[PDB]
Amino acid sequence: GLENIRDAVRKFLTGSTPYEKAVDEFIKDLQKSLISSDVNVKLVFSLTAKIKERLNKEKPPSVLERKEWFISIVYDELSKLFGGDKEPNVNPTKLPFIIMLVGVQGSGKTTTAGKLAYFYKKRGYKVGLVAADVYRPAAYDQLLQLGNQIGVQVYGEPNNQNPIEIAKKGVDIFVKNKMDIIIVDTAGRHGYGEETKLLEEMKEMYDVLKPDDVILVIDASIGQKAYDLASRFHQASPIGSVIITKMDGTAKGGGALSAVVATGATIKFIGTGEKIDELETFNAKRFVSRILGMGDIESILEKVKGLLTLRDVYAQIIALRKMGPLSKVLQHIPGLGIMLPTPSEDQLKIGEEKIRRWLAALNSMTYKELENPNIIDKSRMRRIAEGSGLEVEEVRELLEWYNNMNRLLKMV
């Protein structure tokens, strides 16, 4: 479905045919894959849209083949779609951190709570599972079962028919072991025909218990449909995140992610199995890559990334030490290369662990002391020297150089 993409990339990336007659087969195949992945259609043509707009105005950077630069846009774009920023802060803030699980029946609301509280235990916190799973008694059994199998306490008194009480009772008790994190799996009713039921039972819990985080589990089988419940969810609790489970037992995954994002919700994790370890933090970008191209996008990453005087000094010298292993460097300079056994002189320069003490002292300096250094004194000079590892001599040389250039450009 959506996995057929890397190939569509491994082709577009093997000088298959002419540049433009290739761009299209991709767009054909991308749309095919996306839609075939259950991503909403209006979104797909939309995307390809903002993709042809960029191929238009955006101008290709150096060391960027007509096509690689291309993918840089694809990736970027597929990337905005599924995420749009960096990995959320699955890391708790205040202690204790409290988490509620509002999973619609069949959504693995419970398996996830386990899988999740193991996530955190395994990462070093003192997790506590509160079984407010009222609408399901079988959830109780199965819960404490996997619970004991992982060394986690699970408060709960069956048939209380009132979870909000179970919550306050159970969370206020998990402040005893000074537990760091508390996972409150709130009962999820209305099976599949949910409507607005759980949202009400929710705004309630939030008001009564008032926890630090609220996460609505979604079955990755719901395709782009997930957009409705998700949207009502975000609306209800603009301060919460979605977890999408069973990602691996469907071909309509993309539809859910793209979907849930469409609304504005955040996807902190994604279930990928029945097992307990089957749950990993959702890294939007790494996902787009994981699908576009293994690391092919990686090379594209290096290349694009690294790429009145002491200022330019740093920015300048910095981009130079970075460099990058390739012969396209001279593609910038109006000169045609002749032989290659020569650059081995460059690998050798990088040989000495420490390549330049200049970027070292330039770092050991204030961002102002980098501007007007004629204020630098001998005390300031041994300070910046010892701080960098250099000697007052390696630094005097440095300073004299900035000015000789200060004077030289004056002489032009």
């Binding site: 300048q316 010298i317 130079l320 000697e391 001599e393 390696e394 040389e397 150089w401 250039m405 450009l409």
Partner: peptide, 20 residues
């Protein structure tokens, strides 16, 4: 552009002050 091919350029002329 040539500006740096001079500045970043004429540096090694006396890269001699270095330790041993």
């Amino acid at each position: 552009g040539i500006i740096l091919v001079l500045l970043i350029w004429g540096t090694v002329l006396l890269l001699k002050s270095i330790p041993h």
